[PDB]
Design a protein around this ligand. Structure first.
Ligand SMILES: Nc1ncnc2c1ncn2[C@@H]1O[C@H](COP(=O)(O)OP(=O)(O)OP(=O)(O)O)[C@@H](O)[C@H]1O
Ligand SMILES: Nc1ncnc2c1ncn2[C@@H]1O[C@H](COP(=O)(O)OP(=O)(O)O)[C@@H](O)[C@H]1O
Ligand SMILES: [Mg+2]
Lengths: 85, 86, 458, 56, 86, 460, 115
């Protein structure tokens, strides 16, 4: 076993829109190879406090109960939780 | 971004941890399950225009990037008291 | 070439030379006295020692016995030869007839079909059972699961489904007896061979008297035979007597393999083991496997990890329950847990969808009213609530149906009900057309007309 | 006289209904307690199993 | 054949299994309690004449042997949904 | 010559090392000179290499890691026989009283196998207590187990003393009391109360206090049991009193936890059923002599499905329940006849007449318990004459259940009496079948036999 | 600031995740697990931190702490032990929050030793 000194990287870019891909970046839809704008690391750290900005713009679910009572904003983290089916 | 099932990710990580003989915790899940979900979810954020301008080396100016996340959790018979949903 | 070094119940440790160690799923053969035993590799330990599972009885094995390394996995006959016969986990014939004249043998450890190879079909399939194809209808090529505890009718329901869905199916079928009663398999074999349909049903039996190695891999060999029939361009029906025993054999073995136990007592690989088994059983673009599976839930606990990790793998889950059975309402399908992926108005129609949703609404309201009735009785209810109580009780009675295959336990003649009849009946009850009939008229009847006739004689 | 007789009947009916409710409440107690006992026993077993297994 | 109490055979086997440090499962019974009872009970059966003739090497011919078995199980407070009873 | 060395001390667990020829057997006893005292160790497990793991039958403080250990070839041996009567002893058979040395002729080991199948009695027999309630509603089998399910405030101690006296005098037998892990103050008070009651002469006491290590509290029951076994071999019918069997079970759990064995069920030891059976299977009737046992039972969390109650009930033949409500009425002994049961109460076991009498009494009292609710809610004007007669006879029966004890002489002045089985059966048959309907209900209170009830009514 | 003699206001966002950060790494340090999977040193780890937050004769620290309640159950060892360290405890309840009353303080459970 050789040890390639590089962490796991994944293809990334605009060409992935519409493609079905596995965890390692291999297409499985069968519609040809990807057109990626370089690679990026899977395991990275998040932006710090000084690098954030507040949330004041909406994103519409298209439903009534959600978009009215429990709104979602751009940058928000919403937990959809319940039983099976 | 949608995470269709965080609980199944947690189960896969539990299998990896136990096969590696790491010490088990509550409901046999290792303690770093919270670290897993926390370091995943906190990556979803909105960043100020200074950050965008610095990252793109000046190409994009006056814009704030943003990523919204919708994780999904399955409860067994509505038991909110379970470890992973808590 | 190798020698046995440890014998722990069902698992055996074998030592091989440092340069001649078998692969992860290779098969070994050992001479236990005057008889031969097959071992299957599971793990490569350090120093050329491998852990194996015994595909047979482990008693009588001395340490220090020599073994032979076969250079292939466990391979079973497949195709036209295995079509009227009973077979073991290792593909050996179990009926006292001669050898199986196969042209080809397949290894039982294969890979699930790729994403681009799959096919999803909305072509709906009809059963004679009322509640099943009202509440949770299933289409051709989708997996159906029969949940429930002990003695709630899973086997009888599956026999009825075999009888009815064989009416509109012409091709071959595979039945896998996975860790269940030997008597049930014997009776099924004689019932099949007395109806002259044994020439299309293929049988694999590893039953609840077998050691863990046989029970574990018997499910896989049955599914493999189903793969061979599928890839000839055919549509196959695959019946599994019990899919819980597979995980239970894994549970019995996993402790001896050195794996630290997970929640409850299950192996860490429960999800992966179930995923490996249940993802190579699908309908591709060159075949289709319609499958019915019985899922025994332990201790009537639907929150147990074994049933809980199977709900996500099925198109149509039917949950039998003991309380409904105690009332005599056979089949004891709980209509507030049974669902399907095909219960949508775009595929099943608006009238069917509305009828099913109305049934669920009424029964849910009845459940809410039960706890009021328990303390106060029926007198303190609103008049509308009393109306919905009466209609919910009548609906529950109408969900029952006397099967042909159950004619022995009861005496009533069997009944086959069409979808149009059952939606008409439930639509009639919901809108109160039959408010003038007594409750017992709806018990163990077929179509609604039969209930009216029964009401005439009370 | 009709009204007075009906009030007497009302009190009789109420006392019968209250007796029935009392018995049903006792019936629910004797079963909820079984559920509670099984729950306590199972919870203690699970937690002890976690401790002993976690000793490793 | 009558087994006076299979639940207390299960208790004895649980004691043996716990003295050998085998990790237990539901209600602390070992993982193979089902196999214990399954292979014990499945030995009771009705066998065809061909099997008897093969076993007796032809000395008994045309007769079917049988072994009926009624085991006994004790349940606490009369519920059937317990692990061993089910 | 001492042949062993201590190698570890962890809490109450001591590991000692012997030569490979001299390794002790499983339940042998060892002795160490800890400080100036002698410490007894009971071996529990033979680990490999000549090491044996033991539980200290005493305080473990002050033990070093190089002390020499003497290997006795026998298990714990205790004095047995008549010399033990009137004395209080610890687990090891040594006086915790201050009266002096026990002058025993014989010392027996506390560990032994249960009587064999060929030793059991050829028949099944009833044991009179002389107490009307017990002899009628829940008769004891000679050699059977009886569970006292009463609490406190009710007369548990009074009943125990009455039975000790009656088994000594009316029959010819002795008694053993096993104070399995119970309070020192209350043991002292029990000793003084039996001294005042003049029953100390006819019982032998083994106490294991709560403040002793778990092994002591676990083994004290077996000590009392082997003393009772000696009295059995003399040909007597012995009564063995267990102060609390739940403490025996719980001390077994504690010892198992100290040894490190994996726990079962609700946290109990893996060998719960076996330890319970080892204790209970030795309390049986032999072709000569017998040991009948009264055992106080506490149910944890009021849960009748809990493993300790569930395991214990498998061995009890009869159940006696003591009630504060019955005591408040002044009826003594305060035994509730509706909750107390015995599985000897079958017509082919006790006799058809006795059985049908018991059924009649139980059903009549049950019917009165329902009519009492009705009478409270509506009133006695609603009853019929048949209903009224049932109520009156039930009152008479309830009062006839009471009995004056000899210990109750000091509490009431009543001389105290002993009622035979046929006497109580005849009395309750007479009350059921309408005779003595003309007596007042107070004629039956604390009056002993029915022939004395008529005397009291003659004076009244 | 307290040793300089000034009056200080200290706001701590969650004591719970101090204890939880202890729990994550406890087992990897070789420790045997406690009653509810916590570390065996929960009480001491809480005490060493919380006994430093006191008003001495030189200066005073006034502190407000937010305490998470797992599963909204006050029986859990963490809220149970931190109850014993506080002068005033304002108990919020999910029941009152779900009913729409804000703040969701439970007036029956909330108390202070200055009352
Ligand atoms: N209409 C009916 N449908 C099903 N079972 C019925 C019916 N009427 C009576 N029964 C009885 O219910 C029993 C339960 O049947 P079955 O064995 O199929 O249940 P199960 O849930 O598959 O149980 P197991 O997993 O223990 O084999 C039958 O053996 C039969 O005696
Ligand atoms: N037969 C009796 N005659 C008179 N008084 C009695 C009788 N039985 C019980 N009592 C009264 O009730 C008490 C019973 O409780 P007791 O035996 O003292 O409880 P404990 O043994 O737990 O201390 C007695 O002390 C006495 O006061
Ligand atoms: Mg069945």
């Amino acid at each position: 076993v050789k040890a390639t000194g590089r962490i796991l990287e994944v293809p990334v870019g605009r060409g992935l829109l519409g493609r079905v891909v596995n965890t390692l970046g291999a297409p499985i839809d069968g519609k040809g190879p990807l057109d990626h704008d370089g690679f990026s690391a899977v395991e990275a750290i998040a932006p710090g406090v000084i690098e954030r900005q507040s949330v004041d713009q909406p994103v519409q679910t298209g439903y009534k109960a959600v978009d009215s009572m429990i709104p979602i904003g751009r940058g928000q983290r919403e937990l959809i939780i319940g039983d099976r089916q | 971004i949608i995470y269709d099932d965080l609980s199944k990710q947690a189960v896969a990580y539990r299998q990896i941890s136990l096969l590696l003989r790491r010490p088990p915790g509550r409901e046999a899940f290792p303690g770093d399950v919270f670290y897993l979900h926390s370091r995943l979810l906190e990556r979803a954020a909105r960043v100020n225009a200074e950050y965008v301008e610095a990252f793109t080396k000046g190409e994009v100016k006056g814009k704030t990037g943003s990523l919204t996340a919708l994780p999904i959790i399955e409860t067994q018979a509505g038991d909110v008291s379970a470890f992973v949903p808590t | 070439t190798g020698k046995i070094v440890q014998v722990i119940g069902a698992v055996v440790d074998v030592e091989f030379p440092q340069d001649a160690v078998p692969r992860v799923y290779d098969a070994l053969e050992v001479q236990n006295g005057n008889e031969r035993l097959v071992l299957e590799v599971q793990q490569q330990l350090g120093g050329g020692i491998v852990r194996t599972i015994a595909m047979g009885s482990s008693d009588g094995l001395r340490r220090g016995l020599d073994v032979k390394d076969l250079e292939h996995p466990i391979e079973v006959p497949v195709g036209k030869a295995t079509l009227g016969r009973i077979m073991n986990v290792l593909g050996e014939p179990v009926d006292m007839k001669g050898e199986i004249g196969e042209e080809e043998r397949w290894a039982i450890h294969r890979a699930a079909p790729s994403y681009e190879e799959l096919s999803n079909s909305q072509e709906l399939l009809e059963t004679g059972i009322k509640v099943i194809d009202l509440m949770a209808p299933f289409a051709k090529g989708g997996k159906v699961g029969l949940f429930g505890g002990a003695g709630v009718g899973k086997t009888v329901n599956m026999m009825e489904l075999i009888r009815n869905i064989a009416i509109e199916h012409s091709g071959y079928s595979v039945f896998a007896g996975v860790g269940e009663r030997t008597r049930e398999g014997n009776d099924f074999y004689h019932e099949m061979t007395d109806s002259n349909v044994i020439d299309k049903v293929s049988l694999v039996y590893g039953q609840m008297n077998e050691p863990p190695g046989n029970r574990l891999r018997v499910a896989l060999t049955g599914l493999t035979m189903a793969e061979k029939f599928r890839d000839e361009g055919r549509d196959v029906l695959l019946f599994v007597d019990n899919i819980y025993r597979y995980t239970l054999a894994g549970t019995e073995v996993s402790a001896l393999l050195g794996r630290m136990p997970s929640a409850v007592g299950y192996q860490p690989t429960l999800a992966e083991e179930m995923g490996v088994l249940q993802e190579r059983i699908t309908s591709t673009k060159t075949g289709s496997i319609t499958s019915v599976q019985a899922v025994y839930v332990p201790a009537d606990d639907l929150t147990d990890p074994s049933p809980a990790t199977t709900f996500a793998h099925l198109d149509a889950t039917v949950v039998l329950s003991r309380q409904i059975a105690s009332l005599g309402i056979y089949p004891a399908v709980d209509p507030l847990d049974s669902t399907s992926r095909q219960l949508d108005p775009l595929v099943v129609g608006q009238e069917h969808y509305d009828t099913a949703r109305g049934v669920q609404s009424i029964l849910q309201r009845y459940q809410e009213l039960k706890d009021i009735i328990a303390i106060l009785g029926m007198d303190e209810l609103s008049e509308e609530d009393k109306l919905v109580v009466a209609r919910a009780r009548k609906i529950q009675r109408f969900l029952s149906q006397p099967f042909f295959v159950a004619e022995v336990f009861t005496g009533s003649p069997g009944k086959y009900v069409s979808l149009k009849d059952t939606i008409r009946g439930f639509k009639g009850i919901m809108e109160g057309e039959y408010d003038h009939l007594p409750e017992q008229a709806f018990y163990m009847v077929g179509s609604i007309e039969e209930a009216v006739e029964k009401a005439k004689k009370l | 006289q009709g009204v007075v007789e009906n009030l007497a009947s009302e009190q009789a009916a109420r006392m019968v209904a209250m007796k029935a409710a009392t018995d049903n409440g006792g019936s629910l107690i004797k079963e909820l307690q079984l559920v509670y006992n099984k729950a306590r026993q199972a919870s203690i077993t699970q937690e002890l199993t976690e401790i002993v297994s976690g000793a490793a």
